[PDB]
Amino acid sequence: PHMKHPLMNVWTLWYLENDMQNEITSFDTVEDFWSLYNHIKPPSEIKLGSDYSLFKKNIRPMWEDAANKQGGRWVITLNKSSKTDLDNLWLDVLLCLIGEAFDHSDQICGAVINIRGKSNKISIWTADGNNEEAALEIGHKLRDALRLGRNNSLQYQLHKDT
């Protein structure tokens, strides 16, 4: 019979309309991830100005929290993306996270998609902005896994530098 496939980590989906984060659902198997993803609006259909975030259990999508404050993010820009391309990129990011695709996946905190009209942003948040080996491995694998191009302007920013 079918048996669920556990994930290495527990993850939580957060939704921001525009402190103000809403904790939606947690899951810890591949099938529970799909049960959630299959039933909720994809990024291409959520309210403009909102965010989805997927973070490891006990980390929130708030940069000033202790878990994130010394960290940073790899930021991917999506200018006027088609709906299927937007949704597919977000899903592939989520799968990189929950599947522990990074050698330094331990340094991963979560990912955030900002739905912002003409442009959208997907960011992967890491715990220690000064961990050179981890930051670079994660960035390189994102580029490859997502087939990012120059127009995505993949870049790394410390949270403290805004």
């Binding site: 939606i24 659902t25 049960s35 039933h39 909720i40 609006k41 959520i46 990189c96 522990e100």
Partner: protein
């Protein structure tokens, strides 16, 4: 406790998307986030 990471490839996970266990309506989800609503 020697740790050993539990890792899945994207294709492996995508092949589970249609599983019967992947179709459970999530319980605690606000109506505004449900598909097609």
């Amino acid at each position: 406790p020697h740790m050993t990471k539990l890792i899945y490839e994207r294709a492996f996970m995508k092949n589970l998307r249609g599983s019967p266990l992947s179709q459970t309506p999530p319980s605690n989800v606000p109506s505004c986030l449900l598909r097609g609503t």
